[PDB]
């Protein structure tokens, strides 16, 4: 399992800043906290997937809690943005993007952790492995070298005490809420698979095979050629793995074939393999 939180803090004005933080569990976006300096009242904490309704019915004050935590984080975030904009300025956008991740085994035990910050798309500082030593920018390829001594000074000045609490959250509550979230996420959901051939061109054609609504996201889509003749330029190719609102995924693939051959599409998702005819004769 993996419980990940993404924070995007945008600085537009000294009075215009936005923070949108999203929680993602096993690839499913389930939580969002949003707030703008302009309003702040209208700050919100929403479940963003159907199973979060079950979470709320079982923990009635979950959303109010998270929102209070969010309101606080934004306060600190407002200071951090103003401070980086002043000290670093920006090249493309004055945005601070940071994230923390929790890796656990099925049964909930902590396997790995990570906390990372990036400003204007540039890595600023990270915390990995033992989660005790922060690293900094990759000054060899980053415009951030323009402010190296300032950044190194900020990184060197991070206590072992502000750090440990980040580590204990990752090893503590983070792995603990992962177990809870685990009890509510949907069960393995296999794809609806569809395939066929199209765009006939002389003795050539295009075979396709697409998988719809599967979760988890890992999947294997293969064309099985029951024959010997294949075009020279032929090479199977899949579009990227894409998300849909309901927390499931989508993936389509294609291959150049001789309209001649027998092809089927094999799709393996978890411990399940489906096979359908795609072109016959």
């Amino acid at each position: 399992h993996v419980l990940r939180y993404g924070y995007t803090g945008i600085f537009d004005d000294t009075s215009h800043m936005t923070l949108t933080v999203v929680g993602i569990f096993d690839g499913q976006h389930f939580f969002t906290y949003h707030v703008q300096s302009s309003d702040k009242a209208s700050s919100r904490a929403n479940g963003t997937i159907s199973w979060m309704a079950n979470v709320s019915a079982a923990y009635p004050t979950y959303l109010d809690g998270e929102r209070a935590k969010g309101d606080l984080i934004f306060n600190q975030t407002e200071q951090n943005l103003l401070e980086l904009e002043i000290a670093l300025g920006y090249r493309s956008q004055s945005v601070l993007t940071w994230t923390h991740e929790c890796n656990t085994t099925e049964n909930g035990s902590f396997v790995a952790g990570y906390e990372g910050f990036g400003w204007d798309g540039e890595t600023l500082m990270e915390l990995k492995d033992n989660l005790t030593l922060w690293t900094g920018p990759n000054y060899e390829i980053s415009w951030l070298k323009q402010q190296k001594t300032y950044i190194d000074g900020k990184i060197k000045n991070i206590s072992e005490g502000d750090t440990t609490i980040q580590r204990n959250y990752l090893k503590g509550n983070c792995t603990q809420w992962s177990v809870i979230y685990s009890g509510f996420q949907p069960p393995v959901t296999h794809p609806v698979v569809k395939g066929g051939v199209r765009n006939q061109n002389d003795n050539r054609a295009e075979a396709f095979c697409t998988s719809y609504g599967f979760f988890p996201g890992e999947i294997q889509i293969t064309f099985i050629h029951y024959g010997d003749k294949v075009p020279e330029d032929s090479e199977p190719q899949c579009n990227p793995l894409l998300p849909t609102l309901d927390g499931t995924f989508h993936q389509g693939c294609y291959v150049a074939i001789f309209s001649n051959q027998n092809y089927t599409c094999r799709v393996t998702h978890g411990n399940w393999t489906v096979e359908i005819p795609i072109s016959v004769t």
């Binding site: 979950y62 935590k69 200071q79 991070i158 502000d162 509550n173 983070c174």
Partner: peptide, 9 residues
């Protein structure tokens, strides 16, 4: 759930 603490930059 979100952590209670943010790093001070």
């Amino acid at each position: 759930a979100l952590p209670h603490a943010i790093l001070r930059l």
